[PDB]
Amino acid sequence: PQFSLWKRPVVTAYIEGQPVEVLLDTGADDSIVAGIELGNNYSPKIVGGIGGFINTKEYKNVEIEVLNKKVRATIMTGDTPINIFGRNILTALGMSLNL
Amino acid sequence: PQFSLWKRPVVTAYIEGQPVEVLLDTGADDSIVAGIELGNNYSPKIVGGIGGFINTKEYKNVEIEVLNKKVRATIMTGDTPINIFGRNILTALGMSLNL
Ligand SMILES: CCC(CC)NC(=O)C[C@@H](C(=O)NC[C@@H](O)[C@H](Cc1ccccc1)NC(=O)[C@@H](NC(=O)c1ccc2ccccc2n1)[C@@H](C)O)C(C)(C)C
């Protein structure tokens, strides 16, 4: 699957079985999701954007299913308007930017 | 060119002859750059991400040479910690996201 960027590259993934829409982001070093419960086992992390900082709850070894593919990675959780799949997940999946 | 996503997909662009290092970003709707004087006629705007928003200057029909191509597009200027080329530019170069 090849995505032209005319529209945002958005897909449906299941995080630990819960379905969500995520933006596949080659401009995010990290993945951050909002409104899903991931559990008690996390670490406070502080994160940056264009806008400014945000504090997140950091989950590791999270079961992800996206694009007919199974991965495990670090998910952070927080106040994010759109949910984002960064370069850590993208790499694990085998995606690439082409020209 | 293909960009594995292991490291940030960064490249050298010339914006009106000035060289710049930029982020190729599938999760950026707008293109935003710091430290170039693009001049006088612009339009007052805002740009936001994670953490919040910032004040920008919107210029139109800027000349850019990147990836061995020549485009003309809108670039904002503002105090971004990293220069970003969003989907508006990527779409002009004919870049795609693949798996
Ligand atoms: C360290 C943790 C990670 C967390 C993502 N942060 C980074 O890797 C830093 C990194 C970064 O923040 N990358 C993510 C960026 O790619 C984010 C992703 C995104 C999309 C949509 C909504 C929110 C956020 N995009 C952006 O910052 C661009 N934003 C948007 O396209 C965008 C779209 C819709 C929105 C709706 C409401 C509020 C904000 C909205 N922002 C901006 C350039 O125009 C730098 C500063 C280098 C670009």
What CATH code is carried by the domain that includes residue A74? 2.40.70.10
Dihedral sign (CA A85, B59, B22, A1): positive
Experimentally, the structure was elucidated by X-ray
Give bridge partners of residue A2 from the DSSP assignment. Answer: B98
Distance from Cα B27 to the centre of ligand 1, integer Å: 7
Tokens of A5: 């960027």
Please give the structure tokens belonging to residue B29.
């709707």
What's the gap between Cα A87 and its chain centre? 9
Residues of A in contact with B67 (CB under 8 A): 99
Contact A84, A75 (CB under 8 A): no
Query: How big is the CA angle at A10 (ends B97 and A56), to the nearest 5 degrees?
Result: 105
What's the token pair of residue B68?
Answer: 């061995």
Closest partner CB to B98 (pick from A25, A27, A95)? A95
Cβ-count burial of B92 within 10 angstroms (0-12 exposed, 13-18 middle, 19+ buried)?
middle
* Chains A & B: contacts with CB separation below 8 Å: 136
Task: Tell whether the torsion through CA atoms of A31, A35, A36 and A42 is positive or negative.
Answer: positive
Amino acid residing at A33: V
Resolution in A: 2.5
Q: What is the largest CA-CA distance in chain A?
A: 42
Name the residue type at position A67.
L
CB-CB contact of A76 with A59 (8 Å): yes
Domain residues for the domain of A66 are: 1-99
Q: Do B87 and A24 touch (CB under 8 A)?
A: no
| Ligand 1 pocket, mutate which of B10, B24, B29 (most atoms under 8 A from CB) | B29
Domain tally for chain B?
A: 1
Handedness of CA B26, B52, B31, B16 (dihedral sign): negative
B3/B58 Cα distance (integer angstroms):
29
Please give the Cα distance from A76 to B47 (Å, whole number). 23
Q: Calculate ∠ Cα A18-B6-B71, nearest 5°.
A: 100
Strands A53-66 vs A10-15: parallel, antiparallel or unpaired: antiparallel
Q: What is the Å distance from ligand 1's center to B61 Cα?
A: 23
Closest CA to B5 of A11, A28, A69, A70: A28
